Design a protein around this ligand. Structure first.
Ligand SMILES: CC(C)CCC[C@@H](C)[C@H]1CC[C@H]2[C@@H]3CC=C4C[C@@H](OC(=O)CCC(=O)O)CC[C@]4(C)[C@H]3CC[C@]12C
Ligand SMILES: CC(C)CCC[C@@H](C)[C@H]1CC[C@H]2[C@@H]3CC=C4C[C@@H](OC(=O)CCC(=O)O)CC[C@]4(C)[C@H]3CC[C@]12C
Lengths: 122, 106, 393, 99
């Protein structure tokens, strides 16, 4: 069945680097846009980044641009999120979600399937 | 940078009651609004997409409506499993995603 | 309670007001008929029904005015029995003819606004004439009880004579049936049909306005993209452009939805370049949204602009003014007709309300008679204001 | 001689003026007597003295009591209930042709 699994989280000193991952199963990353939604402990969900196994349009949040690098590897059917220069505000649980492309209903379904999430503490 | 504001920061209700949660957008986002439900320690689950379309596998008690810029989530028959945090979302574009603040229901 | 009376002022105010209504309405309806038949020939279905409505109003103003002298001095009727019949059938005839013609006018407006192509042109004028024939026949046949039963009646020993409705049974259901068809078939069903037609007109008008309003947001932001170079204002212009495209796609089948699918596809392509820090490519990519506008959406935009222009027609404002004023002038009559039909059935047994209903029925007939006089004044909007040229000439 | 009756409805009895009209071959309906309706009892010629019109507020019936019944009084008697004010309506009952 469709399933997204996150891995690569942990605890590092502030200013360190982390390499988050989001494994996928039951679907391909080529026809779905994989996002990264972050929820701070005790706070709400905020969008962080997104990547496409298509042409390659990527984006980042204004409060996170310049220090995050999201990547996708369609060979391994997983998406990675490179982290560096981590600040104290980056401590949160990172969820990876999937979102269909514009033509048709898959786009209208928003983040239909999420991932269990991984915790990062700095 | 469309900001989504959620009216009730909290909503105490009893089992079997009817609750309503309202969202407001900075600009017009058409019907590109989805409703989620996050239980503590767990990832969110999509309830309504397109601001009025119930997702598959979700009980028909949940409902959504849009009147221009105001988006409302309504549950007419609350159950013991409905006690969770209900988030808002505007998904007009991939890089334009902004969520609400939360409507923890007790 | 049995002793009452309010004829001190009714017997003087109504006859002068009735005469004023007669002259004003006959002049206005003659002018309306003259303009509709010569200044703007019967080339449309709406003009055929409006000419018929003016003719029905003329017939009411020509066959009722014996009521003005009937109420001028007491309730004496020193005329013929045939005159009593043809003056008492005219209320029903005018009510049914006018209400049927107004329903057909509403149906024609609905067809002309929301089914521009489903309805033909050659086969409608003949249909309009046949419908007018059937409407006049139905109005005449629904006024037949007031011809058969209405008769002259000498009051007791004195010579005072009235035009009375002769029910040949004390427990007769004809008064209840006549007073209820006047409420249901004369008011209720036509009013429901007209409401459905005008709500469906409004529903299509809203859809037409939604597509053009949403496309206007797309149009204004398109010019903003060209007249801007900061790699940022392009993004906000496309952000409002994408939402307008999504909203417009919800108006409406596959071809319309497909046409807006590439439109939002180009918008996303522009946002991809805008998010990459490129302005010329973002501005260049936003130009193809005009090419796809002509291919798919232009044919649907014109059908929406034309539909909204039909709301601005003079014939639309006149028809809806006539429809609204007819239902406001005749609602006092139908309310008291229903009130009176309840008294006969015994539903309400109260002497005080019975006197009110009896003294109100002459006024309700007076108000309905006023509708024929004020109808030609609605035609003085535009286009038909060429009647001023005819009057001077 | 004999008495006629008119079992009127409740609505007709309360408001309408109920009276008797008479019709014979060679002549139209001529007035005979009337009662109720807020006015006083009215009588016609040749019936002012002999004919008596009565009232019953409980059984909802008006009786025309006639005692002489001579000359050409024989005809068909029709009971009418006319409300002149507002819209005049006449409610004719079943006739009764006397001997
Ligand atoms: C009381 C009842 C039993 C009879 C009432 C008379 C009707 C038979 C008359 C009165 C008004 C007439 C209408 C007045 C105007 C027109 C428009 C007229 O249209 C034209 O002149 C253009 C088309 C053509 O050349 O026939 C067609 C006939 C019609 C419906 C007339 C048909 C005959 C009507 C319905
Ligand atoms: C005792 C009497 C005087 C009460 C009032 C009755 C009439 C004088 C009223 C009732 C309905 C009115 C009409 C209702 C609607 C219209 C359409 C309106 O034109 C529009 O359609 C404007 C709005 C738009 O274009 O969307 C112009 C006024 C008019 C003719 C109104 C004119 C005045 C009318 C006939």
């Amino acid at each position: 069945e469709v399933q997204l699994v996150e891995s690569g989280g942990g605890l590092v000193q502030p200013g360190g680097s982390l390499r988050l991952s989001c494994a996928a199963s039951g679907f391909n990353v080529v026809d779905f846009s994989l996002h990264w939604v972050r929820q701070a402990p005790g706070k709400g969900l905020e969008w962080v980044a997104y990547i496409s196994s298509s042409s390659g349009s990527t984006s980042y949040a204004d409060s996170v641009k310049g220090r995050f690098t999201i990547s996708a590897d369609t060979s391994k059917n997983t998406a990675y999120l490179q982290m560096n220069s981590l600040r104290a505000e980056d401590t949160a649980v990172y969820y990876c979600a999937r979102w269909g492309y514009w033509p048709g209903e898959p786009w209208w379904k928003a983040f239909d399937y999420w991932g269990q999430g991984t915790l990062v503490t700095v | 940078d469309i900001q989504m504001t959620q009216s009730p920061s909290s909503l105490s209700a009893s089992v079997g009651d009817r609750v309503t949660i309202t969202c407001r957008a900075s600009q017009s986002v058409s019907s590109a609004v989805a409703w989620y439900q996050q239980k503590p320690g767990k990832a969110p689950k999509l309830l309504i997409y397109s601001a009025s379309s119930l997702y598959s596998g979700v009980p028909s008690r949940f409902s959504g409506s849009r009147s221009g810029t105001d988006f409302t989530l309504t549950i007419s028959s609350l159950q013991p499993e409905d006690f969770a945090t209900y988030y808002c979302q505007q998904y007009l574009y991939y890089s334009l995603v902004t969520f609400g603040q939360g409507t923890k229901v007790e | 309670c049995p002793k009452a009376g309010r004829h001190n002022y009714i017997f003087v105010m109504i006859p002068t007001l009735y005469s004023i209504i007669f002259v004003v309405g006959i002049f206005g309806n003659s002018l309306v008929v003259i303009v509709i038949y010569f200044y703007m020939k019967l080339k449309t279905v709406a003009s055929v029904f409006l000419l018929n409505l003016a003719l029905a109003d003329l017939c009411f103003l020509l066959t009722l005015p014996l009521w003005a002298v009937y109420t001028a001095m007491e309730y004496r009727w020193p005329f013929g029995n045939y005159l009593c019949k043809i003056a008492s059938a005219s209320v029903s005839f005018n009510l049914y003819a006018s209400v049927f013609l107004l329903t057909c006018l509403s149906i024609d407006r609905y067809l002309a606004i929301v089914h521009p192509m489903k309805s033909r042109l050659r086969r409608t004028m003949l249909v309009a004439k046949v419908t007018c024939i059937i409407i006049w026949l139905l109005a005449g046949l629904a006024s037949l009880p007031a011809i058969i039963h209405r008769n002259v009646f000498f009051i007791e020993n004195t010579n005072i004579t009235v035009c009375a409705f002769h029910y040949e049974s004390q427990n007769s259901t004809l008064p209840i049936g006549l007073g209820l068809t006047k409420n249901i078939l004369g008011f209720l069903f036509p009013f429901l049909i007209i409401l459905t037609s005008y709500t469906l007109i409004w529903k299509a008008l809203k859809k037409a306005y939604d597509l053009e309003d949403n496309w206007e947001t797309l149009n204004d932001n398109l010019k903003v993209i060209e007249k801007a170079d900061n790699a940022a204002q392009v993004k906000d212009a496309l952000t409002k452009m994408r939402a307008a495209a999504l909203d417009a796609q919800k108006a409406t089948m596959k071809d319309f939805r497909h046409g807006f699918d590439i439109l939002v596809g180009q918008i996303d392509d522009a946002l991809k370049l805008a998010n990459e820090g490129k302005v010329k490519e973002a501005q260049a990519a936003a130009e193809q949204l005009k090419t796809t506008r002509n291919a798919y959406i232009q044919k649907y935009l014109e059908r929406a602009r034309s539909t909204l222009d039909k709301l601005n027609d003079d014939i639309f404002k006149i028809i809806m003014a006539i429809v609204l004023f007819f239902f406001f002038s005749w609602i006092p009559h139908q309310i008291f007709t229903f009130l009176d039909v309840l008294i006969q059935l015994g539903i309400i047994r109260d002497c005080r309300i019975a006197d009110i209903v009896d003294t109100a029925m002459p006024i309700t007939i007076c108000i309905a008679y006023f509708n024929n006089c004020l109808n030609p004044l609605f035609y003085g909007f535009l286009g038909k204001k060429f009647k001023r040229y005819f009057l001077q000439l």
